Write a protein that binds this ligand. Structure first.
Ligand SMILES: CSc1ncc(Cl)c(Nc2ccc3c(c2)CC(=O)N3)n1
Ligand SMILES: CSc1ncc(Cl)c(Nc2ccc3c(c2)CC(=O)N3)n1
Ligand SMILES: [Cl-]
Ligand SMILES: [Cl-]
Ligand SMILES: [Cl-]
Ligand SMILES: [Cl-]
Lengths: 4, 123, 123, 4
């Protein structure tokens, strides 16, 4: 999971 | 403020290909010079400008069989159908002309672009 | 010896979401405490272990309406349905418990994992 | 396009  | 799962789109496509391989919820047959290819209308629309136009038509959206132009090569279509469900294109010296012509007919702009580039390198 | 188009899976999912937003070729309604959500069976199956099991059942595969357990929160489902079609999860302090419970019921393992991690950080 |  990432900060888009 | 959303978070994003990097592999989600790839995992979705992988599962859609698993459904195709097991013939689960396929809703159309694409006929190419008597060869038949089962697929999901939504995936075909998501990958191709031609299928997008076909299945948004109020009459064609309900067809279970679509016949392609007799000039379309079944191997070129098969390679493109595999690309639609996997992101992988089996582009070879012996098939590049049939793949490019089929991608132009199907309106798959990114495939047409890489075929033009690979042909230009060989000249 | 295939070549691969990096953005293909993301572009496919983006087009599938465009079809959902315009209600094109949606083939099921998911009912959650009287709230209704239209979607594509194939996308639901590709994202959820529960929908995969439901639509591979020889009787349920033909249903146009699926009713979820009355304990399922409609907002939690809506956030998860958005994630299915975009890879983006709107996870917030006020919804994390409903999102985790819905993801456990829907069998969306990666969502359950990030919810467990975000809850553990707050304790 | 890349070599996967
Ligand atoms: C244009 S809005 C839109 N909305 C939904 C879908 Cl399913 C869709 N597909 C589609 C249309 C055109 C093209 C492709 C896919 C691939 C390509 O090269 N051209 N388009
Ligand atoms: C297991 S083979 C397979 N073949 C096709 C599909 Cl459409 C599918 N979906 C699915 C099954 C289980 C789970 C998910 C999707 C997400 C998750 O967390 N668990 N699985
Ligand atoms: Cl028909
Ligand atoms: Cl393309
Ligand atoms: Cl029904
Ligand atoms: Cl998930």
């Amino acid at each position: 999971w990432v900060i888009p | 403020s959303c978070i994003q799962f990097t592999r989600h789109a790839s995992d979705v496509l992988l599962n859609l290909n698993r459904l195709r391989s097991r013939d689960i919820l396929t809703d159309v047959v694409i006929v190419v010079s008597r060869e038949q290819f089962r697929a999901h209308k939504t995936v075909l629309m998501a990958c191709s400008g031609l299928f997008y136009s076909i299945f948004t038509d109020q009459l064609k959206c309900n067809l279970s069989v679509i016949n392609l132009d007799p000039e379309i090569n079944p191997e070129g279509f098969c390679i493109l159908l595999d690309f639609m469900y996997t992101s992988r294109l089996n582009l070879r010296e012996g098939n590049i002309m049939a793949v490019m012509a089929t991608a132009m007919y199907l309106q798959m702009e990114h495939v047409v672009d890489t075929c033009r580039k690979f042909i230009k390198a060989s000249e």
